[PDB]
Design an enzyme around this catalytic site. Sequence first.
Site, short mmCIF file in Angstrom:
data_model
loop_
_atom_site.label_atom_id
_atom_site.label_comp_id
_atom_site.label_asym_id
_atom_site.label_seq_id
_atom_site.Cartn_x
_atom_site.Cartn_y
_atom_site.Cartn_z
CG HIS A 1 25.10 31.16 -19.15
ND1 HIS A 1 25.11 32.49 -19.53
CD2 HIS A 1 25.31 31.14 -17.81
CE1 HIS A 1 25.30 33.25 -18.45
NE2 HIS A 1 25.44 32.45 -17.40
CD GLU B 1 24.27 34.05 -22.85
OE1 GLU B 1 24.63 33.15 -22.03
OE2 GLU B 1 25.08 34.91 -23.28
CB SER C 1 27.77 34.08 -15.79
OG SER C 1 26.51 33.82 -15.17
O1 LIG Z 1 32.52 30.14 -12.41
C1 LIG Z 1 31.49 29.55 -12.80
C2 LIG Z 1 30.80 28.40 -12.07
C3 LIG Z 1 29.72 27.76 -12.70
C4 LIG Z 1 29.25 28.17 -14.05
C5 LIG Z 1 29.90 29.24 -14.66
N1 LIG Z 1 30.95 29.86 -14.04
C6 LIG Z 1 29.52 29.80 -16.04
C7 LIG Z 1 28.70 28.78 -16.87
C8 LIG Z 1 27.56 28.24 -16.04
C9 LIG Z 1 28.05 27.47 -14.77
N2 LIG Z 1 26.79 27.37 -13.92
C10 LIG Z 1 25.47 26.97 -14.61
C11 LIG Z 1 24.65 26.13 -13.66
C12 LIG Z 1 23.20 25.88 -14.16
C13 LIG Z 1 22.19 26.68 -13.31
C14 LIG Z 1 21.37 25.88 -12.27
C15 LIG Z 1 22.12 25.28 -11.08
C16 LIG Z 1 21.18 25.23 -9.87
C17 LIG Z 1 20.99 23.83 -9.34
C18 LIG Z 1 20.53 23.81 -7.88
C19 LIG Z 1 19.14 24.39 -7.68
N3 LIG Z 1 18.13 23.51 -8.41
C20 LIG Z 1 16.78 24.15 -8.81
C21 LIG Z 1 16.01 24.61 -7.52
C22 LIG Z 1 16.33 26.08 -7.09
C23 LIG Z 1 16.03 27.06 -8.23
C24 LIG Z 1 16.73 26.60 -9.54
N4 LIG Z 1 16.97 27.56 -10.45
C25 LIG Z 1 17.55 27.39 -11.69
O2 LIG Z 1 17.76 28.37 -12.41
C26 LIG Z 1 17.91 25.96 -12.05
C27 LIG Z 1 17.67 24.96 -11.12
C28 LIG Z 1 17.06 25.28 -9.81
#
Ligand SMILES: O=c1ccc2c([nH]1)CCC[C@@H]2NCCCCCCCCCCN[C@H]1CCCc2[nH]c(=O)ccc21
Lengths: 528, 528
Positions: free
Chosen positions: A437, A324, A197
Amino acid sequence: SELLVNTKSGKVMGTRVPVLSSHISAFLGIPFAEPPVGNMRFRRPEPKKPWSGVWNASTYPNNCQQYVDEQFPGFSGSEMWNPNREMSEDCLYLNIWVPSPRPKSTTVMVWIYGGGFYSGSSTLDVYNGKYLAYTEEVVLVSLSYRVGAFGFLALHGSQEAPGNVGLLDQRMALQWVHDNIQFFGGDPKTVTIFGESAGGASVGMHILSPGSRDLFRRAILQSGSPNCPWASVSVAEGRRRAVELGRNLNCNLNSDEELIHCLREKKPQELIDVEWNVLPFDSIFRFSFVPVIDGEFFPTSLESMLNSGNFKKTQILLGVNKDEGSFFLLYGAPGFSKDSESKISREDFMSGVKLSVPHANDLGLDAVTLQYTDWMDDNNGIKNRDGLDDIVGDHNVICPLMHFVNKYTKFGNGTYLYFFNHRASNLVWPEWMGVIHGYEIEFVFGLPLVKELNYTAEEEALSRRIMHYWATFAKTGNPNEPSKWPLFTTKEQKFIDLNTEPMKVHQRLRVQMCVFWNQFLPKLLNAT
Amino acid sequence: SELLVNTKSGKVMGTRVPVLSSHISAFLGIPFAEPPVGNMRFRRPEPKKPWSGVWNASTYPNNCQQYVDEQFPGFSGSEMWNPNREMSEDCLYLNIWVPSPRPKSTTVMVWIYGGGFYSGSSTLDVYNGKYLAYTEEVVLVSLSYRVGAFGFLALHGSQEAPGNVGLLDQRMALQWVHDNIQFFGGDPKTVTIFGESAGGASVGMHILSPGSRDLFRRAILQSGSPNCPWASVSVAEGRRRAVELGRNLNCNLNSDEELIHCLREKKPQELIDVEWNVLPFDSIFRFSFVPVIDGEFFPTSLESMLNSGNFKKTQILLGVNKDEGSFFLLYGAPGFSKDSESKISREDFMSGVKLSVPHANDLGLDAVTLQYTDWMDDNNGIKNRDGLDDIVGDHNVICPLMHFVNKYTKFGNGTYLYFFNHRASNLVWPEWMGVIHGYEIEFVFGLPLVKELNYTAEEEALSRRIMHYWATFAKTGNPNEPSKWPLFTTKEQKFIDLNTEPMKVHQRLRVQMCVFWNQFLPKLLNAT
Ligand SMILES: O=c1ccc2c([nH]1)CCC[C@@H]2NCCCCCCCCCCN[C@H]1CCCc2[nH]c(=O)ccc21
Ligand SMILES: O=c1ccc2c([nH]1)CCC[C@@H]2NCCCCCCCCCCN[C@H]1CCCc2[nH]c(=O)ccc21
Ligand SMILES: *[C@@H]1O[C@H](CO)[C@@H](O)[C@H](O)[C@H]1NC(C)=O
Ligand SMILES: *[C@@H]1O[C@H](CO)[C@@H](O)[C@H](O)[C@H]1NC(C)=O
Ligand SMILES: *[C@@H]1O[C@H](CO)[C@@H](O)[C@H](O)[C@H]1NC(C)=O
Ligand SMILES: *[C@@H]1O[C@H](CO)[C@@H](O)[C@H](O)[C@H]1NC(C)=O
């Protein structure tokens, strides 16, 4: 003693750790930069001052300050990515796993974590490097770097918060490995940097950046590439975001100096609490503070650098997972939930495409919608959900990686491409999310070799094969031991599936959709 | 005597013709307008002056002046469409086939020929109406109308060459049938107008035009619809073309009067020799002189008329053939030839798409190319040839017809849709051309019932079934005799395949591609 190593920064004492009924050495929490605290917040890292006496490297270091996922309290699917050590701005440390007895000069692999440049820790259970270091007899290193505003707030022109300092943290850790790993038995002539990623994007960024190229030999990129749409912003956008962050914390906005000083007096958590407020659009798969195309770490736009061959020429191994996009839709698009099959209405589909391509006008949104809708069965919830999942993954991960791999291969010295599509038997996430992913990582780190984790025998075998492909590539520039994973060439574009069944070789990974994302849509958005 | 009929225009004497070892009556060459010669060239038709004495209608009339296909001298595939009688501007006649003995009040079908509004004759062997009239016991009429510059030269504002006079010729023939067919045994309350290609477009045009609506009951459209991209032009474009025709014949261009007078002094062949020079673009499936959206025959744009229900509400039966585009690519795109399999290079493909959508900018051409290219196998000659064939047929015939049928059905009283996909066993055209534009006609006119033509027994059966569906629909508004051809409805959008095997019912004929041609591309061309 095997656990005492003398380095150019001073002596370090490791710890012996058990692994698969054997043991290896671990040197945890070795500092590679001065703590970037106080007036050092936002600035380029400084090399760690050597110390006299013995550095106790028997325990994991703190994790950098970052957003903490609280969506599913106690759910292992989400918590396995959260910091598992206390957070602190004093977090610039690296970890080393060394086969026992100490090798004299063996292959080194350096892991770069990758939570969207706003999160990640080198200490997660899924990143435990003992299984890979032990099984493939390599010296395994995991580094750390500042994430979020702490590592990427960018006010181009200012030397106090120039941007890209998180990338400079990575570079400093690579400089330290280059200069000191020979003392741990690693071969500085044979270092492979690998990451998933944002870590995969970072790997591609050091391949591009002149100042990083000479610090390593080869590279592995997992579901991430430097040109991803979420991986960098212009200096003008980085500037607007820093100014908007300042505005959310009631900072004086009269000058860079005033803004930065205000930001330096805030507790870490105050910056993280409003971090998501600065995105310029309602969106998914977009992160606030990311690398900036600055004219220094990146001499020119990533596309002209790719087009002109302005990058390290060597061998790369890279690939993507089948679904993904699911992680991001689950957390950020209406109609998706962890506990339901998440069949999506036509309306949620359309609102999902708007979120997925925030930079598109109506004509472009129409073009994506037409491309991913089966008009013979447009009210099919499953097809709508799956079409959206592909839009997110193709736009954010797969097509940018394919564009990177075709540009790179024209000038490089050997490319191996994979498509990871095995749904783990013990996955705790719902079925609709597929091959998520990040879920190839546990196979790369050999978690299936530990019985208590409950993987199948064929999964343990898949893990052993992936770890051996990764280590053999790190050692020789070819994953194959001299069923062959064929070279990806400009002409034939071959790749293999990576899963529990007999290896299949295919060609032109998602070409149909990637011509749309890499050639047609950008033209459309630019013309109109 | 059965062969003498008295009409409001005077007496007419027909001839007895043999058919399938029986006989029927034919009244050939009955005039329905004054000859449109001399100062009448380009003007609206005038009703024929009644005559005293007996009109000898024992022989076919002259054909209107038109371009003559000389591409394959003596080849029956092409020559079967050429005028087979002498050409003359004195050509406004109609033909009637009447069952024997004379019916009292039976279903009437009126055939409108359709060679792109620039060609066509009511006398072709494939239009011999004796088989249908005899087998289904209907009174069959074929009319004629001026084509090319003679029927469609348009200088809006002038009463000397107002445009649409060829459509007014058709209307006059329909007025004559309405007023006189009862004397031949036809029921003026039950007249179905049917036509293929430009005749199918014309049928839809009388359905739209207020001044034509009351002259007939129901309608059949074969591979043509009023809104086709080649079927009409604006008054400004019609004007430019007439002016350009004038320029090719060294006419004084100072005023409409000067232009028209110059054009009226030219022999018919001088106009036809330069007719193709006035197209505004390098193109395929585009004809010089066609109907004009004039504010009179068509009160407003065809699209607002369709959207508002401004059209005759009744039953329609319509459909398309599988490879509508092949005829046009063969004759006008590089790389296609009659005697080769015509595998097309990527380069000829691209030059074929430019020819096919002459009105598109580069972004639109890219959108068509992406939509029709299999990027996993882009150098496949067969896929390139077939993709081009579909582009031409979808853009020019299928998608415009589908847009017409969905708009019509919202306000109409019954729609039946078909997809004709039978490749005739004795076709003389090459295999690559498939089910060609125009080749369902011979089945509609029952040619397979004549043994010497060499069709198979199953083809004779297909012909009998199509003629009975067409006549039963003409008589009742439903092709089925009370395996059922289901009604096409707004909701379910059903249609049937028409071929030698068991009837299959499907839904949403080419929806995927037609959303592209009817909704996306126009938006794209308009935005950019
Ligand atoms: O070293 C690391 C640390 C974490 C991770 C990995 N590797 C690899 C695997 C994946 C993992 N992280 C995935 C984590 C999944 C992705 C989404 C986390 C965002 C939540 C907070 C924000 N909430 C909302 C509002 C803002 C915009 C927004 N945008 C979005 O794309 C999704 C939600 C939101
Ligand atoms: O009553 C009739 C009379 C004829 C026909 C039918 N019906 C129905 C079946 C079809 C038949 N007519 C098909 C006939 C096949 C269509 C093409 C004939 C045009 C040739 C002359 C012009 N040659 C070039 C230069 C000008 C632009 C141009 N554009 C092109 O689309 C193709 C070639 C050219
Ligand atoms: C090493 O440091 C850790 C810090 O908690 C501690 O557990 C351990 O006792 C220390 N060992 C030595 C030799 O200082
Ligand atoms: C890599 O470089 C070596 C020597 O510079 C060359 O001989 C070899 O063919 C190259 N391999 C590839 C895959 O380009
Ligand atoms: C009818 O006209 C045609 C014209 O050639 C001719 O063959 C035939 O003899 C005529 N019959 C009568 C009764 O005039
Ligand atoms: C056609 O019209 C009749 C009477 O006006 C109506 O009862 C019938 O349902 C209509 N049929 C269709 C298919 O709309």
